[PDB]
Amino acid sequence: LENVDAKIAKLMGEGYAFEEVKRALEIAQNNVEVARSILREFAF
Amino acid sequence: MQIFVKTLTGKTITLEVEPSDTIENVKAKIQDKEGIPPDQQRLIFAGKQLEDGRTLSDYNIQKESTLHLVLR
């Protein structure tokens, strides 16, 4: 219902690895905009 | 049985599969119908990234399940 697999796939497409994206969406409580900010901020 | 694979470009690919098909088999089918090599493919289902040597059934992927494809 929340669109988790689609949200994982979308953020993976922005250049992030599966485990990072999964973990960021968890932290963000499935908010794509917030997970994206996490991924950008803490990229290495 | 049939499963679906959604791509980020909005495409829905329908595959003809058996429960015992390996993830690599599934990647090969996607290649046959779309042209993407298995090594450029990442498949996501039910919060998991699908591993090559395991089967659809190992992930409780049933008829009419939708996988999500991301290209590397």
Swiss-Prot record, chain A:
Cellular location(s): Cytoplasm
Swiss-Prot/TrEMBL induction comment: By serum starvation.
Domain of life from the UniProt record: Eukaryota
Domain UBA: 3-42
Post-translational modification (record): Phosphorylated on tyrosine and serine residues upon TCR or BCR activation, and upon various types of cell stimulation. Auto-ubiquitinated upon EGF-mediated cell activation or upon T-cell costimulation by CD28; which promotes proteasomal degradation.
Effect of residue 39 to A: No effect on interaction with ubiquitinated proteins
Entry comment describing in which tissues the protein is expressed: Expressed in placenta, heart, lung, kidney, spleen, ovary and testis, as well as fetal brain and liver and hematopoietic cell lines, but not in adult brain, liver, pancreas, salivary gland, or skeletal muscle. Present in lymphocytes (at protein level).
Disease per record: Autoimmune disease, multisystem, infantile-onset, 3: An autosomal recessive disorder characterized by autoimmune manifestations apparent in the first months or years of life. Clinical features may include hypothyroidism, type 1 diabetes mellitus, systemic inflammatory manifestations such as fever and hepatomegaly, and autoimmune cytopenias.
Domain writeup: The N-terminus is composed of the phosphotyrosine binding (PTB) domain, a short linker region and the RING-type zinc finger. The PTB domain, which is also called TKB (tyrosine kinase binding) domain, is composed of three different subdomains: a four-helix bundle (4H), a calcium-binding EF hand and a divergent SH2 domain.
Its job: E3 ubiquitin-protein ligase which accepts ubiquitin from specific E2 ubiquitin-conjugating enzymes, and transfers it to substrates, generally promoting their degradation by the proteasome. Negatively regulates TCR (T-cell receptor), BCR (B-cell receptor) and FCER1 (high affinity immunoglobulin epsilon receptor) signal transduction pathways. In naive T-cells, inhibits VAV1 activation upon TCR engagement and imposes a requirement for CD28 costimulation for proliferation and IL-2 production.
Further comment found in the protein's record: This protein has one functional calcium-binding site.
Subunit structure as annotated in this protein's UniProt entry: Interacts with SH3 domain-containing proteins LCK, CRK and SORBS1. Interacts with LCP2 and ZAP70. Interacts with CBL. Interacts with SH3 domain-containing proteins VAV1, FYN, FGR, PLCG1, GRB2, CRKL, PIK3R1 and SH3KBP1/CIN85. Identified in heterotrimeric complexes with SH3KBP1/CIN85, CD2AP and ARHGEF7, where one CBLB peptide binds two copies of the other protein. Interacts with poly-ubiquitinated proteins. Dimerization is required for the binding of poly-ubiquitin, but not for the binding of mono-ubiquitin. Interacts with EGFR (phosphorylated). Interacts with IFT20.
Protein name per its UniProtKB record: E3 ubiquitin-protein ligase CBL-B
Gene that encodes it: CBLB
From Swiss-Prot, chain B:
Domain Ubiquitin-like: 1-72
Residues flagged as site, Essential for function: 68
Protein name: Ubiquitin
Post-translation changes: Phosphorylated at Ser-65 by PINK1 during mitophagy. Phosphorylated ubiquitin specifically binds and activates parkin (PRKN), triggering mitophagy. Phosphorylation does not affect E1-mediated E2 charging of ubiquitin but affects discharging of E2 enzymes to form polyubiquitin chains. It also affects deubiquitination by deubiquitinase enzymes such as USP30.
Top-level taxon of the source organism: Eukaryota
Cellular compartment(s): Cytoplasm; Nucleus
Job description of the protein: Exists either covalently attached to another protein, or free (unanchored). When covalently bound, it is conjugated to target proteins via an isopeptide bond either as a monomer (monoubiquitin), a polymer linked via different Lys residues of the ubiquitin (polyubiquitin chains) or a linear polymer linked via the initiator Met of the ubiquitin (linear polyubiquitin chains).
Coiled coil: none
Site (Interacts with activating enzyme) residue list: 54, 72
Phosphoserine found at: 65
Sequence position, cross-link Glycyl lysine isopeptide (Lys-Gly) (interchain with G-Cter in ubiquitin): 6, 11, 27, 29, 33, 48, 63
